[PDB]
């Protein structure tokens, strides 16, 4: 199924996933499309941060749902 991952920079990333996909696998899929290492990714759905070791079904993510991707980056 398709889900949408929205960044704080306006970009929308479409991903092909299964409900049984682990959060680590979803992060690895994002790296293959955008090149962001999984250590930099924060995934958010329904105001909750997705924890590693769980699957998308644990958060009741359906087809064409929208996640948010905050990146662990900073500047000075």
């Amino acid at each position: 199924m398709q889900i949408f991952v929205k960044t704080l920079t306006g970009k929308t990333i479409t991903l092909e996933v299964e409900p049984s996909d682990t959060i680590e696998n979803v992060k690895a899929k994002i790296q293959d499309k955008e090149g962001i290492p999984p250590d930099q990714q924060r995934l958010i759905f329904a105001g909750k941060q997705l924890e590693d070791g769980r699957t998308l079904s644990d958060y009741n993510i359906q087809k064409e749902s929208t996640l948010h991707l905050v990146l662990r980056l900073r500047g000075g």
Partner: protein, 169 residues
Amino acid sequence: VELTQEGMHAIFARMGYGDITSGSIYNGVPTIDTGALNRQGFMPVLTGVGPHRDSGHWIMLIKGPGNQYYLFDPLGKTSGEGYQNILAAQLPMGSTLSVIPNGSGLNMGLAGYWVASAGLRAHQALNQHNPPTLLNVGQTITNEMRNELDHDGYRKITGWLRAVADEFP
């Protein structure tokens, strides 16, 4: 001492700007939502980041009247010209991008604060009926940055940045 991407968005929400869209130059590739930039009138941009570096530099895009855009680099004008060409190609056709001519040596590693503070003052200064020249806007920015640092600004800003970094990841 450095402002995260989420910390920057949280700052503008607490300042009454709602949910903003920001930009980035990640691994050399820019991401600029020019629809959001046109609607917001500004956009903080996190540059110098990529797969092997999470700590970069904050700059600020500004929309002026008409088709004019501006780049505020807290490191000075010449640092801003290093981004001018790749950021100009992201703007709508017919646009012109100018680097605000402010002085160097005053960033002190506080670009997140300078963007959220001096960058917005530069936005209001350039978007009025009788604005000062681009030369005067950069000179005002240089003087304000130097005057804040003269009034123990480094100790006050670094302390305030540590507070914001404590209320968030």
